Design a protein around this ligand. Structure first.
Ligand SMILES: Nc1ncnc2c1ncn2[C@@H]1O[C@H](COP(=O)(O)OP(=O)(O)OP(O)(O)=S)[C@@H](O)[C@H]1O
Ligand SMILES: Nc1ncnc2c1ncn2[C@@H]1O[C@H](COP(=O)(O)OP(=O)(O)OP(O)(O)=S)[C@@H](O)[C@H]1O
Ligand SMILES: Nc1ncnc2c1ncn2[C@@H]1O[C@H](COP(=O)(O)OP(=O)(O)O)[C@@H](O)[C@H]1O
Ligand SMILES: [Mg+2]
Lengths: 568, 573, 91, 95
C-alpha cells in the first residue's frame, strides 16, 4: 500500500480529537464544499498570504466530515494529507518518483473516489525535475481526484499561473486574512486548550491586548499566527516563572515585554514642551506646535491617511533646527539619529527627482531603489529631514505634494511607501533676513503672515495648501544664545565626564566663549564650532601632552586673550 | 528495546559522569526550556557555528536533568540521542535500515512524552538516506514532527538552516531559531577553569591560570579557522600532550604560557609595537628621518587613546616632489599596521578637477559613470574597512571635494549617495601635493627643517584654507634626495638584479663610478626616481642581456660594471 | 562499494579505533567539514608544501636512493637547480 | 601551454570591468579562472593594441619627439583607462 507510506489520514486524527477546534472561516469552507462537488475540476486551491490558517480550513473540513455538517455527498470521505516533500525523497534513479506517485494514484483509484486528497504547498508539484503535474493532470482534469491544494498567493501566481493547464485544473478559493476581532474570536476559541496544556490561566484583556498589539506593531507576520505566537510564548514564560522557585495569569504587560524583546507616555506628553526645552532653549512656538501635533497623533484625532508632521521650518540656521529634530526623534520614538537626513542642496535637476523616487523599470538605478523611499522602507517609524529644501529643483515639491497629502509615495520599482508613522521636516531660509531685521517688537502673527506671503510668492499654491503649520524660527537674543552656550558647556561637561574628568571654568572664560562667535546672521553654530575648536585644541592637546589627571580640580582660568587650564 | 540497540542515552552518561561538565550557557538553556514547554513549535533547533558548543548545551541540559536543576515539566525526561552508523551497522537489505528507523520512531511514540530526541546536523539527516526502493531519514521523521509524537531538539549551522529548513513549510514552522552566541574571552576562561581538572587528571600534568588567559586571548587574537571555545580547549590539550611527550622522550608538569606560545608558534603590544615601527621604517624607506620621527609621534599620540575616537586616525599632508617614496611610505605603513603591500588605498586626485568629483569618487548618481561601479572611495572602504587611504594630488581638487574632506576630518564616518553608512576611524587618510616643491628643490640646503616647515605651511595657507588645514595632524617635508639616498635605492634595485643573476649563476659588482652614472642619469628633480628604474633597466640590462646570450660571459667571474665615456660596460677578467 | 563508513565511522564513537588519516585539503573542505557528525574526532594536520631548503635535503637523500637504479652520478648543482627551477617554472 | 603570446587586440572596445581581470594578470601573473584555480601567466608576452590617440598622433607626430608624444597620448589613455592599470604596463609604445 502506497497511501500509508505517504499520506496522513486527517479525519482519523480528528476522530481521536487531536486537531484544533477551528472556529470561524465558515464561508471559505462553504466555497470549498461547492468546489469539491462538481463533476470535472473538483480541485480547490486555498490561496492567501502565509500564516492565515489554511491547514486550519482543511482541519475544519475534516471535523465537519466527522461530525456530519457536510452535504449528502461527503459523509464517509477520508481526508488524506499528501506529502510532496516525501515523494522526491530517494530520487536517485530514473522512474522512482513515478513509481511512488503511480502507487498513490492507483490506490486512490482503488477507493472509488472516497478520498479527498490534501496536497499542501502546491508550488512543490510544478517543479519536480514531465514530472508531477503531468501524472496528476489527467486525473485532476476528469474530477476523479479531489485534490484540495493549499499554497501562498505569491507562489501561486509565480509557479501555477505560469502553467495554464495545471492552473485550470484547479479553482481558487481566496482566503482573507482575518480581522482583529476575528483574531479575538479565534483566541477565545483556543484559550481552553492552552490553559489545559500549560495548566495556567489566561486573562482575556491580555488576549485582546495581545491581538491589538500584534496587529499594530508587527507588519511581517500576520494574524492569527503572530497572536498565537505571543500567547504561547507568554504562557511558557509564565510557566517557567512559576516553575523556577509569582503569577499564573498572563497580563498584557508580559505581552508587551515579549513584543518589545522579541502607559506613562501620556504623562510624558503632557510635559512634552518641557521635554523639548530640556535640550534646546528658546523657540517656544515650534515646540508648542510640534508637541500639539504629537499629542494629536498619539491621541488619534488626526486623519490616519496622512503623515504626522507637515512642518515648513524657516529662518536662518543655528536657531535650533536640527538639534530640535534630533531631540524630537529621541523623546518621540528612539534616538537623536534613528532618523533620516536628506541634503536637498544636492537635488537640482529632473534626474534628481528620479534619484529620490527611484528609476523607472528598464533604466539605470532600478534595482537599487530610490533614496527617500528606500530610507523610509528601511525605517517605517522614523523622521525625515530635508536639509535646505529651497535649494531643490521646483518639481521636487510635486513629490512632496504626494507626500504631505496622502502619506504614500510610489517608487520606481512599483510599490508604495507608507508615511503615516513619520514626520516630514523641511528646512528653508526664504525669509531669514526679513525676520532678522524685524524681530524687534513685532509680534509672531504678523511676522508669520509676512513671511507666509513671501514664501507664497516663492512656492507653488498647491504646496502651501498642504502644510499643517508653518513656524517662523525667530532669531534668538543674546541671553537665549548665551543660555545655548551654557547648554553646550553642560553637554561638554557630560562628554568630559564620559572621558572621566572634572573640569571647572571661570565665569570670565564663559563670557569670552559666549563672545567668540556670536552672530544673529549665522546662528549659534559658528559660536558652537568656535567654542569647540578653542577648547578641543588646547585642552585636549594638554591632555595629550601629559598634564591632566582624572580627579584633580581643573579650572579653565583666563589668559590675556586665551583660556588656560590648571591642575589643582 | 530498539532504543537500547542503536541509540545513545545522554542522561545515563551524565548520571554516570561520563560526559563533559558545562559551565555557562544558562540563558540558552533557559530559552530552550521556554521553547520546549509549548504546544505549538515544540521543537527547537540550536543554530550555532562550527565549534561554539552546540553539543555542550544539550550536555548541560542533561546534567541539569540529572541534577534536578530543570523545571518540573522536564523532570524525569530521558534525552536519547540519535546515532547514524549504529543504525546503519548491519542493514543492507531492501527495507532493513528503514524498518529499524521505523522501529525507533515507534519506540519514540511508545514512550509517550518522556523522551527528547537530539539530532546533531539536522540538515544532514534530512538529506542522508540515499537508498534504493526505500526511503530516507528526513521524509520518514517528517510525519513524526507534525503529529506531536516527537519532542525533537535540533542543532545546525546557520547557513544550512537558511537553505534547508527556511525553504520548507512544515519543517520551518516546526522549528525555532534558538541562536547560540559565540562566547566571550572571559566566558572561555570560566569554561576552561571548569574543565582544567579533567585534563589535569587525564594527562597527569598541571595547568597555570596565566597560561589559560594567555591561551584564550591569543587564540581569539590569532586563530581564524576555529572559533571559541574549541580552539582554546584544543590548545590546552595539545600543550598537555606535548608536556607528556617531554616527560616521555626527553621533568615538568606545570603548563606555563611559554609552552602555549611555543605550541601556537609551532602551530607584548604597545612599546614593542613602537620599537618595531621605529626600527622597521628604516629598512625599506631610506632617509626622511624627520618624517619617520613625525609618524612615530603621530602613532604615539593616536594610540595613546587620550584623544577623541570620534575622528579618523590619519590626517596628513605630505609635501615634496615625486620620486621620494611617498608610495613607499604608504606601503610601509600598510606593511606594519596591516602587514601587506596592497593593504592600502591609493587614489590619484589629478583627474577630478572638473565638477564630476564626488560622483566618480564617493558614489555616483544614477545615469552616470560610477553608478554601476560601486564607488572609488566609500565602496573601496567597504572592501577594505581595515586599511590606509592615500590621496595623491590634492591640489587638483574641486570645491565639492573639500566638503567630503571636511566631513571626514570632522568625523571619518561618511555616507555616499546611495545612503549607506561608512566609517573611516580605523584607517589613515594621507594627502599629498607638490606646491612648495620648487622652494624645497631650491634651498633645502643651508636651511633648517622647522622654519622650512613653517614657510611651506605659509605657502599652503596661500593656497589652502587655514580652517581646512587646521584639522591636519602634521605636515612633513620630503626633501630632494640627491646622492646617498639615490645610491641606496639604486643599490636596492641592483641587489634584486644581482639576486636574479646569481641564481642564474653569475657574480656582478658595480663600480662606484658606474653607480654615479646611474645617479646622474636616473635622477631628475622634476620626476625623482622613476627615470632611475627605467634607466637602470635600459643602460644596465639591455647590453647585459645582449652580452649573456652572445656567448661571452662565462660563469664564475666577478663581472665588474666599469664605465665607458658615457656608457656602462660589463667586462670579464 | 553500509559498505565501509557505517562499519568504521561508528568505531570513532566507540573508541576501538585509533586511525591516522590522509587526504587533500579539497576533500577535507568538501567531504569532512560538511560531514559534521565526525568533526571532533580529527585534527587538521596542515602539512605545508616544503620550501627550497627541505626540498634540497629530501633530494639529497633520494639521490642516494636513485644512484642504485639509474647507475649515474647525480651532481649537487643539479639538485639545487632541480629544486629552484621546479619551484619557478612549474605552477 | 605556459609559454605563449597573448594578444589582446583592440582592447579599448572592451567593457571596463574586463580590465580588472587584466589588472590581476599584470599585477601578479596569476589569474583566478571560473573553476577556482589559478593559471601562471609569468611566461607569456601580453600585448595589447589600441588607437586611442588616433587624431592626436596623426596631427602632431611631426615637430614632436617620442617622449613628449608618449606623455600626451599617455594622458589621453589616462582619460580612458585607469591609472591603476597603465601604471602596470611595462612599456607603452607609440606608433
Ligand atoms: N479559524 C481558526 N480556528 C482555529 N484556529 C485557527 C483558525 N485560523 C487559524 N488558526 C490557527 O492558526 C495557526 C495556523 O495554522 P496553519 O493552518 O498551519 O497556518 P496557515 O494559516 O495554514 O499558514 P501556512 O501557510 O500553512 S504556514 C494554527 O495554530 C491554527 O490552529
Ligand atoms: N626612500 C626610498 N627607498 C626606496 N625606493 C624609493 C624611495 N623613494 C623613492 N623610491 C622609489 O621611487 C619611486 C617613486 O615613486 P613615487 O613614490 O610614486 O614617487 P612620488 O615622489 O611619490 O611621486 P608620485 O606623486 O607618487 S608620482 C618609488 O615607487 C620607489 O620605487
Ligand atoms: N561550556 C562547555 N562545557 C563543556 N564543553 C564545551 C563547552 N563549550 C564547548 N565545549 C566543547 O567544545 C565542543 C564544541 O561543540 P560544538 O560547537 O557543538 O561542535 P560543532 O560545532 O562541531 O558541532 C564541544 O564538543 C564540547 O566538547
Ligand atoms: Mg499550511
Amino acid at each position: 500500500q502506497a497511501l500509508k507510506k505517504y499520506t496522513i489520514d486527517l479525519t482519523e486524527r480528528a476522530e481521536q480529537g487531536k486537531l484544533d477546534p477551528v472556529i470561524g472561516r465558515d464561508e471559505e469552507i462553504r466555497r470549498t464544499i461547492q468546489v469539491l462537488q462538481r463533476r470535472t475540476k473538483n480541485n480547490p486551491v486555498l490561496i492567501g498570504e502565509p500564516g492565515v490558517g489554511k491547514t486550519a480550513i482543511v482541519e475544519g473540513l475534516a471535523q465537519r466530515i466527522i461530525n456530519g455538517e457536510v452535504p449528502e455527498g461527503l459523509k464517509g470521505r477520508r481526508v488524506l494529507a499528501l506529502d510532496m516533500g516525501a515523494l522526491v525523497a530517494g530520487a536517485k534513479y530514473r522512474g522512482e518518483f513515478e513509481e511512488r506517485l503511480k502507487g498513490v494514484l492507483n490506490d486512490l483509484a482503488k477507493q472509488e473516489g472516497n478520498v479527498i486528497l490534501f496536497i499542501d504547498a502546491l508550488h512543490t508539484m510544478v517543479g519536480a525535475g514531465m514530472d508531477a503535474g503531468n501524472m496528476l493532470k489527467p486525473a485532476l482534469a476528469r474530477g476523479e481526484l479531489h485534490c484540495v491544494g493549499a499554497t501562498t498567493l505569491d507562489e501561486y501566481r509565480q509557479y501555477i499561473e505560469k502553467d495554464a493547464a495545471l492552473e485550470r485544473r484547479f479553482q481558487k478559493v481566496f482566503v482573507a486574512e482575518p480581522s482583529v476581532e476575528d483574531t479575538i474570536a479565534i483566541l477565545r476559541g483556543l484559550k481552553e486548550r492552552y490553559e489545559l496544556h500549560h495548566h495556567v490561566q489566561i486573562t482575556d484583556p491580555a488576549i485582546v491586548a495581545a491581538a491589538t498589539l500584534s496587529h499594530r506593531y508587527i507588519a511581517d507576520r500576520q494574524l492569527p499566527d503572530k497572536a498565537i505566537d505571543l500567547i504561547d510564548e507568554a504562557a511558557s514564560s509564565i510557566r517557567m516563572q512559576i516553575d523556577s522557585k509569582l503569577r499564573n495569569k498572563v497580563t498584557d504587560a508580559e505581552i508587551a515585554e515579549v513584543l518589545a524583546r522579541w502607559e506613562s507616555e501620556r504623562e510624558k506628553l503632557l510635559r512634552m514642551e518641557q521635554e523639548l526645552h530640556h535640550r534646546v532653549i528658546g523657540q517656544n512656538e515650534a515646540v508648542d506646535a510640534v508637541s500639539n501635533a504629537i499629542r494629536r497623533s498619539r491621541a488619534g484625532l488626526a486623519d490616519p491617511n496622512r503623515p504626522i508632521g507637515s512642518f515648513l521650518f524657516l529662518g536662518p540656521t543655528g536657531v535650533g533646527k536640527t538639534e530640535l529634530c534630533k531631540a524630537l526623534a529621541n523623546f518621540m520614538f528612539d534616538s537623536d539619529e534613528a532618523m533620516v537626513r536628506i541634503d536637498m542642496s544636492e537635488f537640482m535637476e529632473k534626474h534628481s527627482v528620479s534619484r529620490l523616487v527611484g528609476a523607472p523599470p528598464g533604466y539605470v538605478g532600478y534595482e537599487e531603489g530610490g533614496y527617500l523611499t528606500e530610507a523610509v522602507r528601511r525605517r517605517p517609524y522614523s523622521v525625515i529631514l530635508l536639509d535646505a529644501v529651497e535649494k531643490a529643483h521646483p518639481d521636487v515639491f510635486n513629490i512632496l505634494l504626494q507626500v504631505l497629502d496622502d502619506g504614500r509615495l510610489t517608487d520606481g520599482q512599483g510599490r508604495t511607501v507608507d508615511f503615516r508613522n513619520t514626520v516630514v521636516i523641511m528646512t528653508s531660509n526664504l525669509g531669514s533676513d526679513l525676520i532678522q531685521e524685524r524681530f524687534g517688537e513685532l509680534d509672531y502673527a504678523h511676522m508669520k503672515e509676512l513671511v507666509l506671503g513671501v514664501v507664497s510668492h516663492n512656492f507653488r499654491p498647491e504646496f502651501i495648501n498642504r502644510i499643517d503649520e508653518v513656524v517662523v524660527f525667530h532669531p534668538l537674543g543674546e541671553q537665549h544664545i548665551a543660555s545655548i552656550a551654557q547648554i553646550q558647556l553642560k553637554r561638554l561637561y557630560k562628554r568630559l565626564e564620559e572621558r572621566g574628568y572634572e573640569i571647572h571654568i571661570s565665569d570670565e572664560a564663559l563670557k569670552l566663549l559666549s563672545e567668540n562667535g556670536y552672530d544673529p546672521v549665522y546662528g549659534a553654530r559658528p559660536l558652537k564650532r568656535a567654542i569647540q575648536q578653542q577648547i578641543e585644541n588646547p585642552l585636549a592637546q594638554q591632555i595629550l601632552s601629559g598634564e591632566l589627571v582624572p580627579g584633580k580640580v581643573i579650572r579653565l582660568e583666563v589668559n590675556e586673550d586665551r583660556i588656560v587650564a590648571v591642575q589643582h
